[PDB]
């Protein structure tokens, strides 16, 4: 539709309110491919559309912004998504990325290893994950909620996402986690966003907009994933690269959002209201320090 001129399609609210049972995902346009602009990689196009969509939300964008990007490596040994995030984010934004496999990156710092080995002293204003294991796409077996890196991501959000911060976590039909959907109810708003360039895939980015640190809504994640699949199963999305050709308003605006350090007792309804509107970040403004745990073994 007119959807073809958008960067993608967000889950309509009415689908989020259903109580569907989980079914197999069968996409009409499966196997179609979008026509990408000459020489442009899928992952650049995909991240560009994700960022175009995030431009439409009430993201908090402070000075000294901190962003961490999981699953940033490619089979190519480079980091196309990181390159798009750094283009999108205000100059000077601190960008850390990470992957199981080695890769070369434009991020300010890169950690190679299982995400579970990653620790940070500081909190973050935005968390992006494209972590994915294609071994999950097993259509011959039951599609249960997955643990692994999703367990890490849920804990990482709860421990290290600043209040007011946001996330975009990639999921698919088989790569998903019920607690992660439940944690979407701890944000002022949430959706599942499908890029128009990859609309033939059950991929989406689960987006949590403005973290509140407590449940605003109780979400059953098994049901919500079924609701997501029902939406995808019944709403074919036309593959489109149209939005890639207008980059004039791409950069994320440096809003200079306020950062305050507050203890849990001081987070009142007024603070919660500011957090919910993208007008406040709550965290320390200390130095950004990261590490990766290394297992040591002597095989001799």
């Amino acid at each position: 539709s007119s959807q073809a001129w958008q960067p993608g399609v967000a889950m309509p609210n009415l689908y989020k309110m259903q109580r569907m049972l989980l079914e197999k995902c069968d996409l009409q346009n499966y196997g179609d491919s979008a026509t990408l602009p000459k020489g442009i990689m899928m992952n650049v196009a995909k991240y560009t559309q994700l960022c175009q969509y995030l431009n439409t939300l009430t993201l908090a964008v402070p000075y000294n912004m901190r962003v961490i990007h999981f699953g940033a490596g490619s089979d190519k040994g480079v980091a196309p998504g990181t390159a798009v995030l750094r283009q999108w984010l205000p100059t000077g934004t601190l960008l850390v990325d990470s992957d199981l496999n080695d890769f070369v990156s434009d991020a300010d710092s890169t950690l190679i290893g299982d995400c579970a080995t990653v620790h940070t002293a500081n909190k973050w204003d935005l968390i992006i994950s494209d972590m994915y294991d294609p071994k999950t796409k097993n259509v011959t077996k039951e599609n249960d909620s997955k643990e692994g890196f999703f367990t890490y991501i849920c804990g990482f959000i709860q421990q290290k996402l600043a209040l007011g911060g946001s996330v975009a976590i990639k999921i698919t039909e088989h790569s998903w986690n019920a607690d992660l959907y439940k944690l979407m109810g701890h944000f002022a708003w949430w959706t599942a966003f499908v890029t128009n360039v990859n609309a033939s895939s059950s991929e989406a980015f689960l987006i949590g907009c403005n973290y509140l640190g407590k449940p605003r809504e109780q979400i059953d994640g098994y049901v919500m994933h079924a609701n997501y699949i029902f939406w995808r199963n019944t709403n074919p999305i036309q593959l489109s690269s149209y939005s890639l050709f207008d980059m004039s308003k791409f950069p994320l605006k440096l809003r200079g959002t306020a950062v305050m350090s507050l203890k849990e007792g001081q987070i009142n309804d007024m603070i919660l209201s500011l957090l919910s509107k993208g007008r406040l970040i709550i965290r320390e403004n200390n130095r950004v320090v990261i590490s990766s745990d290394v297992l040591v073994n002597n095989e001799n």
Partner: protein
Amino acid sequence: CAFAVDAAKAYKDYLASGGQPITNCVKMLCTHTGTGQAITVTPEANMDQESFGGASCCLYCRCHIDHPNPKGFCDLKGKYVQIPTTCANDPVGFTLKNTVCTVCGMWKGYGCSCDQ
């Protein structure tokens, strides 16, 4: 270290021998209405250029070898490099073989008009 690998010479010699240029340099989407300077904090391609993520266009980054800067600093990583569209089949070769004007920030020979 009287011995040090000369990766630059190896790649130049490889290209001259008909070797395929390094691929998977990360090309960015942009307006192509930028300043045209060579190495910038955000994509700045003009109508005659493509913009690429810098690390992916750096011979030393891509080959996993030390940078020749004594402190091992990289001119490209974390920035965007503008490559003439006519040379965009080999961004690594282009950045390796060419030089940025310290005055106007354009590529010597591909935008710099200071000798004028």
